Amino acid sequence: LRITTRKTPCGEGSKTWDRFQMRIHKRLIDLHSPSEIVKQITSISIEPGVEVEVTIA
Amino acid sequence: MLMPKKNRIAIYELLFKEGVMVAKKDVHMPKHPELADKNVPNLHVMKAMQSLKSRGYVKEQFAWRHFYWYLTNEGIQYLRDYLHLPPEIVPATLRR
Amino acid sequence: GHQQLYWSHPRKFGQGSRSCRVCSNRHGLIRKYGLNMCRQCFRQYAKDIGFIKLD
Amino acid sequence: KSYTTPKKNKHKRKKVKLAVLKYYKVDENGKISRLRRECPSDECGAGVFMASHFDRHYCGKCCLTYCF
Amino acid sequence: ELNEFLTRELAEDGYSGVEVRVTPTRTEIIILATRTQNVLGEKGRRIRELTAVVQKRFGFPEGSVELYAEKVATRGLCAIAQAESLRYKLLGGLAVRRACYGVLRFIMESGA
RNA sequence: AAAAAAAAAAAA
RNA sequence: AGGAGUGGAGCCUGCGGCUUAAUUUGACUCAACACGGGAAACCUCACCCGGCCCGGACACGGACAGGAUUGACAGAUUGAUAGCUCUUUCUCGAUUCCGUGGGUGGUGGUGCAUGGCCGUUCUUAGUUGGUGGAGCGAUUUGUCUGGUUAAUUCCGAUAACGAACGAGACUCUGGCAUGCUAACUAGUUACGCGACCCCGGUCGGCGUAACUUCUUAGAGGGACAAGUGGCGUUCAGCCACCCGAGAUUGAGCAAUAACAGGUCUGUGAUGCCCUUAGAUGUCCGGGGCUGCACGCGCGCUACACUGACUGGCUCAGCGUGUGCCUACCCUACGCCGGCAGGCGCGGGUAACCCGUUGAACCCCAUUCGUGAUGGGGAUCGGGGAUUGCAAUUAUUCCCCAUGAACGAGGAAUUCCCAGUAAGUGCGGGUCAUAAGCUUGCGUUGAUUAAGUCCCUGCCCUUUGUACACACCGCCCGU
Ligand SMILES: [Zn+2]
Numbered sequence: 121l122r123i124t125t126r127k128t129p130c131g132e133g134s135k136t137w138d139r140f141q142m143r144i145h146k147r148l149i150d151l152h153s154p155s156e157i158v159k160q161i162t163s164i165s166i167e168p169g170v171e172v173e174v175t176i177a
Numbered sequence: 178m179l180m181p182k183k184n185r186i187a188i189y190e191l192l193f194k195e196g197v198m199v200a201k202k203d204v205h206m207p208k209h210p211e212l213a214d215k216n217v218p219n220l221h222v223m224k225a226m227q228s229l230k231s232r233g234y235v236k237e238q239f240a241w242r243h244f245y246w247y248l249t250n251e252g253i254q255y256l257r258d259y260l261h262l263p264p265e266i267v268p269a270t271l272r273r
Numbered sequence: 274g275h276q277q278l279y280w281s282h283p284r285k286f287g288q289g290s291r292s293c294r295v296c297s298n299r300h301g302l303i304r305k306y307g308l309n310m311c312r313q314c315f316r317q318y319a320k321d322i323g324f325i326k327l328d
Numbered sequence: 329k330s331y332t333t334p335k336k337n338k339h340k341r342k343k344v345k346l347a348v349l350k351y352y353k354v355d356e357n358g359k360i361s362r363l364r365r366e367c368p369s370d371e372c373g374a375g376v377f378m379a380s381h382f383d384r385h386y387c388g389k390c391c392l393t394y395c396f
Numbered sequence: 397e398l399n400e401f402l403t404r405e406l407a408e409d410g411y412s413g414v415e416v417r418v419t420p421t422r423t424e425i426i427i428l429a430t431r432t433q434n435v436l437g438e439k440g441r442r443i444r445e446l447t448a449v450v451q452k453r454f455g456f457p458e459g460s461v462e463l464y465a466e467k468v469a470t471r472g473l474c475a476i477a478q479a480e481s482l483r484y485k486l487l488g489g490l491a492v493r494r495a496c497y498g499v500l501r502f503i504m505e506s507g508a
Numbered sequence: 509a510a511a512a513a514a515a516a517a518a519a520a
Numbered sequence: 521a522g523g524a525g526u527g528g529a530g531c532c533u534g535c536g537g538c539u540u541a542a543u544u545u546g547a548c549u550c551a552a553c554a555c556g557g558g559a560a561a562c563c564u565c566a567c568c569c570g571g572c573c574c575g576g577a578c579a580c581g582g583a584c585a586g587g588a589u590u591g592a593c594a595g596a597u598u599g600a601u602a603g604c605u606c607u608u609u610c611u612c613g614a615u616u617c618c619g620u621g622g623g624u625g626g627u628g629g630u631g632c633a634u635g636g637c638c639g640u641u642c643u644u645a646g647u648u649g650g651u652g653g654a655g656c657g658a659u660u661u662g663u664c665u666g667g668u669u670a671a672u673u674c675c676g677a678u679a680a681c682g683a684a685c686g687a688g689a690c691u692c693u694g695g696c697a698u699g700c701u702a703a704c705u706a707g708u709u710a711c712g713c714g715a716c717c718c719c720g721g722u723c724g725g726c727g728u729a730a731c732u733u734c735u736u737a738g739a740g741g742g743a744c745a746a747g748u749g750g751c752g753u754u755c756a757g758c759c760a761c762c763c764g765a766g767a768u769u770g771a772g773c774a775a776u777a778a779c780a781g782g783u784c785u786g787u788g789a790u791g792c793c794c795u796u797a798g799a800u801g802u803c804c805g806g807g808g809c810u811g812c813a814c815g816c817g818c819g820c821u822a823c824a825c826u827g828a829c830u831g832g833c834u835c836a837g838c839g840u841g842u843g844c845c846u847a848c849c850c851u852a853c854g855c856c857g858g859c860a861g862g863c864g865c866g867g868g869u870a871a872c873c874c875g876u877u878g879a880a881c882c883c884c885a886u887u888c889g890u891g892a893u894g895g896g897g898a899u900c901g902g903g904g905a906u907u908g909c910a911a912u913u914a915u916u917c918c919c920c921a922u923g924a925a926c927g928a929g930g931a932a933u934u935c936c937c938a939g940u941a942a943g944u945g946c947g948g949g950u951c952a953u954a955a956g957c958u959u960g961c962g963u964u965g966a967u968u969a970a971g972u973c974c975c976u977g978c979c980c981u982u983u984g985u986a987c988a989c990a991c992c993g994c995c996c997g998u
Contacts, residue, residue: 124959129313130783131556133639139328168417179590197445199453231577239788240401241295270445275573286952289563296787313786321399327692335798377610386593388611494520514989
């Protein structure tokens with residue numbers, strides 16, 4: 121997500137800019153297992169860093 | 178300040194159940210979002226609580242766009258005097 | 274009627290439909306990814322969002 | 329303050345007296361006789377009267393005009 | 397918004413920082429403050445009414461938030477907490493030189 | 509017939 | 521040494537000036553002038569003309585349910601169906617009307633009260649302790665005659681050794697591992713089927729046995745002047761060459777000290793001054809920021825044949841994509857219309873759908889023929905579509921007419937060493953309608969040089985000082 125803004129709050133000075141990015145990495149694993157293991161995985165290893173979402177087709 | 182009566186006592190009874198409410202700073206907003214069951218304004222609401230500020234019953238914090246109000250025990254006994262309730266029901270902030 | 278003439282210009286469109294969510298000023302807005310918030314407060318609170326100096 | 333353009337004053341409602349004693353007519357009997365037609369709508373109550381104009385009677389908060 | 401809210405609220409209670417955690421039905425947040433006896437108030441009233449404020453302002457199902465309180469170790473090793481400490485000292489009114497030497501000696505005795 | 513006077517006044 | 525140019529012509533934008541009831545203001549050498557993310561039809565708005573509401577919280581004192589006041593109707597009334605007034609009060613019932621203090625608000629003044637932020641000195645390479653030495657001491661050596669590098673980067677001469685900041689070091693991307701860990705939301709190869717030609721050929725046509733060869737992205741390494749020869753105190757280091765993917769890819773942060781540099785018009789960051797009901801607050805309507813003898817600066821288009829026009833062929837990557845307040849998302853397919861556009865019809869909350877993003881330039885085949893011409897499209901008239909409450913002072917686009925200046929521009933001046941300048945096209949911000957601006961992406965892709973202090977600035981050493989508020993200095997005489 122690249123966002124380029126200015127540097128001066130006013131309109132005086134050298135025409136200088138700044139750059140903002142993140143690194144966002146996506147991982148998925150498909151599993152051939154029943155839903156009880158899925159709920160055990162959801163309940164275990166809870167951290168605020170990475171969120172867990174599950175879908176069934 | 179040509180504001181009605183039943184809306185203000187509705188605000189007061191929802192204050193006595195929980196002594197904190199939030200309200201965004203928007204004069205051009207005819208409807209309160211949380212109090213959507215009946216037609217209430219927002220500017221009259223925030224003017225009523227800044228009148229309570231002038232009386233000295235709550236204290237005010239303004240962070241980004243929302244006014245924040247906090248209930249005092251002297252404000253609690255003011256609510257007891259104005260609503261004329263016996264001292265046997267307490268707002269849920271003091272309870273466990 | 275003052276109560277019916279108070280809202281005669283709709284804010285369906287234009288620059289008046291949005292303002293800053295911090296300083297409440299209608300200049301230098303960021304509509305990208307729905308920030309809806311001005312550039313100087315963006316620079317002030319950009320570190321708290323998660324935005325970093327990498328480039 | 330007093331500028332070049334004069335300011336039109338606000339509508340000073342003159343305090344009338346014995347208006348509430350002017351609704352019904354006092355006789356020997358205790359029955360009521362009002363001079364204002366009643367409000368049959370649900371917006372204004374049964375005790376709400378009309379106005380007393382020269383030609384047509386007007387509601388209060390109903391803001392409804394019933395002509396003849 | 398939460399960081400600016402707690403910075404504006406706990407100006408005199410020794411606010412250091414907060415941590416945000418995401419969990420279904422247990423969206424809990426922990427505030428680290430220097431003054432543990434003042435963030436709770438009277439039998440934990442203040443933490444519960446701040447919980448009510450953030451609950452009714454941010455918007456969740458009720459009972460999904462459980463705020464905790466914790467004292468951060470190495471209070472002198474936090475640049476924020478020393479900044480509100482210096483602001484608290486200078487708001488009472490003292491000399492800048494002696495207070496600055498006191499906070500410099502406190503940082504040097506804190507192990508920095 | 510016009511000026512500007514330069515000094516900020518400890519180091520708790 | 522060169523390349524592209526600007527300054528010349530037309531057009532867009534800003535400033536000055538003039539004009540205006542108003543043409544709101546800041547910013548005047550680098551370090552202001554396509555700047556305030558400022559492409560202003562209405563809000564923007566701070567400017568002018570006009571009219572209502574209080575948003576006077578409130579403390580005290582006059583008034584209190586018997587009424588303190590808002591909300592309105594035939595009609596003069598601007599501008600409106602604002603009752604703002606005037607004909608008439610029921611309607612709100614203590615929520616209040618009035619006098620003083622007090623309070624609030626202000627894109628009002630003060631950036632020379634400031635905080636914070638940013639620019640500039642300067643991204644040049646410049647600062648500082650500890651110990652010891654010299655001097656009575658202020659102070660000086662360390663920081664240097666010299667050689668080298670982008671670098672106070674090293675070597676080395678040497679009462680100097682031992683360290684820190686800045687630079688380097690660090691982080692991100694690319695350059696490649698036919699290695700490793702893995703891809704039905706990316707594909708490859710085999711097999712089967714289907715379509716056509718003549719036994720093989722093509723299919724981004726269909727389906728299912730392995731795989732990372734493309735793509736995707738994790739862990740690792742490679743590159744370090746490693747080797748040879750030459751120059752050089754044979755040191756630091758430099759040059760040429762071989763093997764090797766690369767023997768200088770680019771960007772971020774950037775030391776001490778300082779500017780009367782800019783921002784009270786980003787903030788509910790903020791001191792003082794002014795004002796506050798008949799408002800320098802707010803709301804609504806219209807106009808004005810665009811206005812025109814003129815002068816300056818960013819940019820666009822061309823001054824043609826290395827070109828214009830008409831058809832065919834063929835080639836990408838950053839991206840973006842349905843909303844808390846909010847309602848404005850990206851589109852394929854199928855008809856109507858020359859066209860901009862109109863109606864149905866699905867997909868996508870995203871490697872799946874737009875999309876294999878069939879981009880432009882370029883290439884191939886005609887027409888054109890040195891003529892202000894088929895170049896250039898300024899100016900101008902009419903018609904037709906979409907956005908929005910509203911397009912006149914053309915919002916934008918489409919179609920046909922209209923075809924000016926311009927024959928490569930004086931003085932003067934700017935940017936640039938490899939996928940670089942330059943010619944193109946595509947995304948993001950601006951956005952209801954929306955790019956002549958800016959930030960990125962991608963195609964093609966050069967000439968010249970591996971140096972100098974001449975110009976223009978910066979830095980350092982030495983020298984002189986009757987200067988220390990420091991030459992914008994001190995100081996003599998009538
Ligand atoms: Zn009625």
